[PDB]
Amino acid sequence: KMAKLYMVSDASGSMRVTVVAEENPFSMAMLLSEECFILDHGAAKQIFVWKGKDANPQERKAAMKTAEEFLQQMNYSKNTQIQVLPEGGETPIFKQFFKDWRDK
Amino acid sequence: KMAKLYMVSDASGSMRVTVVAEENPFSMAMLLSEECFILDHGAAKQIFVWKGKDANPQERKAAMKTAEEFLQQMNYSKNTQIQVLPEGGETPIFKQFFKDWRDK
Ligand SMILES: [Ca+2]
Ligand SMILES: [Ca+2]
């Protein structure tokens, strides 16, 4: 199944959910420390919320809400696994979507 | 460290976050299938969002947002682990807070 990467940010003056990569494998550089991201692999029962260390509280809350909205918007089941990852606390399964993950 | 159990529900006509148990160990019967719950063990770096199989989309979104609000409200670090559990998909660590967990 093919995953999609979204950015959750209010850096534009309003809270926006935008597509940053249509298909995996993704590049690690796509994850910006100042924002939050949603990695949607809902067709394979998995969504990840990634929270940049420099993302603000509004963005962090919006990213959590957005993961839940995806279940309704894309008609994913209630049993969809949602993983919540702070920047630096990423799991091997999350890293697996990236062609060039380099640990800091 | 001592955990606290909260209910996230709009069954009253408005979205409310209420205390259902001040201290662990909790009773499994406290988890109502029609609502969402937050198990706060933030002092030990762990928060759990539990989503009842019969909870509505508004409650599910509010519970996700609430876990993030707890970090700001209780001054927990950005590295606090947040586990998201659908009813029936509970982890051993979540079950460990209950004196009488009985799998269905
Ligand atoms: Ca930002
Ligand atoms: Ca309800």
Residue numbers in the entry:
A (entry chain A), B (entry chain A): 247 to 350
What does the publication say?
Adseverin is composed of six GH domains (A1–A6) and shares 60% overall sequence identity with gelsolin (G1–G6). Adseverin was first identified in chromaffin cells of bovine adrenal medulla, where it acts as an actin depolymerizing agent that disassembles the cortical network of actin filaments in response to bursts of intracellular calcium, leading to exocytosis of secretary vesicles. Crystallographic studies revealed that these binding events involve the association of eight calcium ions, six of which bind at a conserved site on each domain (type II), whereas the remaining two are also stabilized by contacts with actin (type I; refs 17, 18, 19, 20).
Unexpectedly, attempts to crystallize the active form of A1–A3 in the presence of 5 mM calcium led to a structure of Ca2+-bound A3 following protein degradation within the crystallization drop. Attempts to crystallize the active form of A1–A3 (aA1–A3) using a 5-mM CaCl2 supplemented protein sample led to the appearance of a single crystal after ∼80 days, from which a 1.8-Å data set was collected. The conformation of aA3 is highly similar to aG3, with a r.m.s.d. in Cα positions of 0.82 Å over 93 Cα atoms, and differs from inactive iA3 and iG3 by the position of the second β-strand and the straightening of the long α-helix. The structure is stabilized by Ca2+ coordination at the type II binding site, which involves interactions with Glu280 carbonyl, the carboxylates of Glu281 and Glu305, and three water molecules with bond distances ranging between 2.3 and 2.5 Å (inset). As previously noted for gelsolin, this Ca2+-bound conformation is incompatible with the formation of the A1–A3 latch, suggesting that calcium binding at A3 moves A1–A3 away from the inactive conformation through straightening of the A3 long helix resulting in the disruption of the A1:A3 interface. Furthermore, the structure of aA3 obtained by degradation of A1–A3 in the presence of calcium indicates that A3 may exist in a conformational state where it is distant from A1 and A2. The predominance of Int2 at high calcium concentration may explain the slow degradation of A1–A3 and crystallization of A3 in the presence of 5 mM calcium owing to the increased accessibility of the A1A2 and A2A3 linkers to proteolytic cleavage.
